[PDB]
Design a protein around this ligand. Structure first.
Ligand SMILES: Nc1ncnc2c1ncn2[C@@H]1O[C@H](CSCC[C@H](N)C(=O)O)[C@@H](O)[C@H]1O
Length: 371
């Protein structure tokens, strides 16, 4: 995709209306969300969708109920807003307590047990007594385990739709919801001779330790540029996460801008910067969406997202490369780290003209220079 194509919102038809989607937004052609859309029916007057993506799963409620939507992904909120669907940039556990008759939750299984648990308790807290929860998931991705927990939190629950491994259940709140679990975690790490304490909420990439690929990028970068090679330089960190690259680069004296699509990760980065007395811009952004048109950088770094077990580079990750080439000043440099068999080489050759391989073992670090 071109950068314009990556950022473009496209409306797709459904009976009676339209829904905007875009590359990089969850909830489109997803069997879990599709099964929800075929299942959900109004109950009471006020609904909350805790993981809406582009908003397909709970769409049948729109115009029959008041529907609120809490979403962490910037890309998804762009779509919801374009679709005219009320939505807030919000963590699931920011939901108002006892204010809803119906909650809809496509299980965020990809973000892990702690994130799912926090979402389940948020659901239980959001509901009034006697309110109901639609819970959708995948038997291959913890549905039975999470459905059992939902039943324990709420009361009576039953599967109301099934297709292959995919399930939707309906549950009733029959008991008081517990307090939110503890959400924040911290860990220390020594990187390039300096001590850092990272802080993060559930669901982030590489919770609890610095990812070895990220460490490798930093090692390649300091070897190439020197310990002073980053001072006073403008750096963009594409997909900043809780700041494994952002914090050390800020420490080394770079003026760093982190862009990150996931709200929980942006908040994590912000807490880490504060805790380590470091300053950087921690932007909630779909790739470079939050930047001015004119913004350019001296150095761009990235450990792009990847699909677990997948052989194909994600649209978002392809866009990171395209945006990197476009956002570098002449003579600016790009560092990217990935699993060794992801086909980044032809992409860098296309966008930069040439590239180098600075490291290759458990991961590869690729390098390019703007001409
Ligand atoms: N559309 C998008 N725009 C910006 N960041 C995105 C994105 N899609 C995924 N990401 C982020 O890309 C990151 C890739 S994982 C790398 C995290 C961090 N830089 C580290 O090295 O530890 C995740 O934090 C993920 O949420």
């Amino acid at each position: 995709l071109t950068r314009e194509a990556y950022h473009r919102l496209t409306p797709l038809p459904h009976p009676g209306g339209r829904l905007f989607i875009k590359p990089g937004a969850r909830g489109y052609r997803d069997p879990v969300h599709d099964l929800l859309q075929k299942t959900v029916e109004p109950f009471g007057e006020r609904a909350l969708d805790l993981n809406p993506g582009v908003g397909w799963g709970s769409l049948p409620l729109e115009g029959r109920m008041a529907v609120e939507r809490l979403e962490t992904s910037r890309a998804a909120f762009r779509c919801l807003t374009a679709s005219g669907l009320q939505a807030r940039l919000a963590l699931p556990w920011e939901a108002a307590a006892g204010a809803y008759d119906l909650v809809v939750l496509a299980l965020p299984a990809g973000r892990g047990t702690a994130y799912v648990q926090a979402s389940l308790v948020a659901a239980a807290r959001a509901l009034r007594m006697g309110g109901r929860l639609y819970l959708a998931g995948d038997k291959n991705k913890g549905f039975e385990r999470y459905f059992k927990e939902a039943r324990a939190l709420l009361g009576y629950g039953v599967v109301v739709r099934r297709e292959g491994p995919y399930r939707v259940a309906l549950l009733e709140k029959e008991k008081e919801a517990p307090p939110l679990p503890s959400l924040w975690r911290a860990f220390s790490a020594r990187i390039l001779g300096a001590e850092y304490t990272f802080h993060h909420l559930p669901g982030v990439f590489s919770a609890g330790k610095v990812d070895p690929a990220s460490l490798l990028l930093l090692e390649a970068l300091q070897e190439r540029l020197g310990p002073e090679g980053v001072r006073g330089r403008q750096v963009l960190d594409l997909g900043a996460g809780y700041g494994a690259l952002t914090l050390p680069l800020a420490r080394m004296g770079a003026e760093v801008v982190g862009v990150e699509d996931d709200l929980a990760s942006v908040l994590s980065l912000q807490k880490g910067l504060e805790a380590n007395a470091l300053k950087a811009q921690a932007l909630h952004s779909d790739v470079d969406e939050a930047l001015t048109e004119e913004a350019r950088f001296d150095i761009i770094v990235t450990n792009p997202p990847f699909h677990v077990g997948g052989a194909v580079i994600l649209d978002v990750a392809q866009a990171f490369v395209n945006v990197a080439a476009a956002r570098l000043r002449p003579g600016g440099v790009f560092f990217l780290v990935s699993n060794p068999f992801l086909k980044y080489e032809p992409l860098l050759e296309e966008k930069f003209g040439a590239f180098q391989t600075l490291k290759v073992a458990e991961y590869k670090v690729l390098f390019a220079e703007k001409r």
